[PDB]
Ligand binder design. Structure first.
Ligand SMILES: O=C(O)c1cc2ccccc2n1Cc1cccc2ccc(F)cc12
Ligand SMILES: [Zn+2]
Length: 226
C-alpha cells in the first residue's frame, strides 16, 4: 500500500496474509480475504505449488494469540484465467480446516445483490504489500482510500476491460495498491467490490482490480460443490 495509514489492529478481521511457495525460487506473498470459514478469495496470479494462510495478523513479524496459521488443501483458479491478458484473475483457496471465529478473525459476506459498480466513489483497500517502488513489504497491515475511476483512465493497460475489471486510484495522487497487495479486497461502503490484480511497475496509479460481480455465479458454484 502506497500513501496509506496503518490499520487499527484487527479492524479488518477477514484479511488473509498468503505465503506462496514455488519449487524454484523463494517465497512470494499476497493478500486475500476469508469468505467462508474454510475458503479464502485471492488473485489467480498468486497460485503456487503450496500456500499457507495466516489469519488474525496485524504485525506479521510478531507472533500472537490472534494468529491462525492454516493449511490450504486445494487451489481453485477461475477456469477462464488467462496469464497473458490477466482476465479472470481470481482464485479460491480451500482450507484444510475451518478457521476459528474470534474478535480478530471472521468472514466478509456478499449481499444477495450482484450489482455493477459505476465510477466516481471512494473505496478502501488494505494489504501488507510494498510502500513504494524501492521499499519492502509493510510489517503492519496498511490501508488507503482510493477513487473509483471511469474506465478510460485505465486505457493504457491495453488488456483492461470495463466489464471485467475496476479502474482504481486517481492518477493525480501517489495513493495506490501495489506489489504484495494482490488479492486484497476493495471495499466500497463496506462491501467487497473487487480484488487487487495488477498495475504499473513504477507504481503510478490507477491500478486494475478484478470485478467480483462478474464471478458471483462461479464463486457460488465452487462453494456449493466443495
Ligand atoms: O508482487 C505482486 O503482487 C505481483 C505479482 C504479479 C504477477 C502477475 C501479475 C501481477 C502481479 N503482482 C501485482 C502487481 C505487479 C506489478 C505492479 C503492480 C502495481 C499495482 C498493483 F496493485 C499490483 C501490481
Ligand atoms: Zn493483536
Amino acid at each position: 500500500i502506497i500513501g496509506g495509514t496503518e490499520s487499527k489492529p484487527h479492524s479488518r478481521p477477514y484479511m488473509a496474509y498468503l505465503e506462496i511457495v514455488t519449487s524454484n525460487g523463494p517465497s512470494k506473498f499476497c493478500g486475500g480475504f476469508l469468505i467462508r470459514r474454510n475458503f479464502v478469495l485471492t488473485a489467480a496470479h498468486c497460485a503456487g505449488r503450496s500456500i499457507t494462510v495466516t489469519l488474525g495478523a496485524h504485525n506479521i513479524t510478531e507472533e500472537e494469540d490472534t494468529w491462525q496459521k492454516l493449511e490450504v488443501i486445494k487451489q481453485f483458479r477461475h477456469p477462464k484465467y488467462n496469464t497473458s491478458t490477466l482476465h479472470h484473475d481470481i482464485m479460491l483457496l480451500k482450507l484444510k480446516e475451518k478457521a476459528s471465529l474470534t474478535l480478530a478473525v471472521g468472514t466478509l459476506p456478499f449481499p444477495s445483490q450482484k450489482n455493477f459498480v459505476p465510477p466516481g466513489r471512494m473505496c478502501r483497500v488494505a494489504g501488507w504489500g510494498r510502500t513504494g517502488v524501492l521499499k519492502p513489504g509493510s510489517d503492519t497491515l496498511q490501508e488507503v482510500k482510493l477513487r473509483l475511476m471511469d474506465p478510460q483512465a485505465c486505457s493504457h493497460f491495453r488488456d483492461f476491460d470495463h466489464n471485467l475489471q475496476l479502474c482504481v486510484g486517481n492518477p493525480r495522487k501517489t495513493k495506490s495498491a501495489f506489489k504484495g497487495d494482490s488479492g486484497g479486497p476493495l471495499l466500497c461502503a463496506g462491501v467487497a467490490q473487487g480484488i487487487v490484480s495488477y498495475g504499473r511497475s513504477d507504481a503510478k496509479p490507477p491500478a486494475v482490480f478484478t470485478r467480483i460481480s462478474h464471478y458471483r455465479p462461479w464463486i457460488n458454484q465452487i462453494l456449493q460443490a466443495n
